Design a binder for this molecule. Structure first.
Ligand SMILES: *[C@@H]1O[C@H](CO)[C@@H](O)[C@H](O)[C@H]1NC(C)=O
Lengths: 40, 49, 76
């Protein structure tokens, strides 16, 4: 079985305070609308 | 996107659809009407000789 | 110079009874810590971050996993 996330798996890449700052980064993430495997 | 306290409010994948690439080159979540050169493209080889 | 407390003391009381109890001169491993002072141009060292500025009481509020802050141009 399968489903998807629609927006999931976003974590803080570093210990840096920023306030109202758009910030691009390149790291290991989970893509939007991506299939994950159901389990029981 | 960070708020005024340091919490991630929103996020954008820069590879999903070309509207997100347009957002990812302009560093914003709203885009004004126009045309925007984003990236390149290149036909990939199929086998090796 | 600012570093956290010395907490992970290795058990040197379990095979004998910080190498100060005895190149042997540069084996240290605790890290020293002086006290801070405000409103004067000093050379600060916060946990490996080095600079030269005027340290002042703040108004911002962090999140309890964060160490320092930056800005638009990514300056501390
Ligand atoms: C930001 O911090 C303030 C504390 O003054 C809090 O009241 C507020 O709910 C926080 N979140 C926002 C503005 O999204």
């Amino acid at each position: 079985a399968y489903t998807n996330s629609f927006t999931r798996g976003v974590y803080y890449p570093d210990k840096v305070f920023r306030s109202s700052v758009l910030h691009s980064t390149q790291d290991l993430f989970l893509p939007f609308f991506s299939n994950v495997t159901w389990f029981h | 996107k960070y708020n005024e306290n340091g919490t991630i409010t929103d996020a954008v994948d820069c590879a999903l659809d070309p509207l997100s690439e347009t957002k990812c080159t302009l560093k914003s979540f709203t885009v004004e009407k126009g045309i925007y050169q984003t990236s390149n493209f290149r036909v990939q080889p199929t086998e090796s000789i | 110079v600012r570093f956290p407390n010395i907490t992970n003391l290795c058990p040197f009381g379990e095979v004998f009874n910080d190498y100060s109890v005895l190149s042997p001169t540069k084996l240290n491993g605790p890290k020293k810590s002086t006290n801070l002072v405000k409103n004067k141009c000093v050379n600060f060292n916060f946990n490996g971050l080095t600079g030269t500025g005027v340290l002042t009481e703040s108004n911002k509020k962090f999140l309890p996993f964060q160490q320092f802050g930056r800005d638009i141009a990514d300056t501390t």
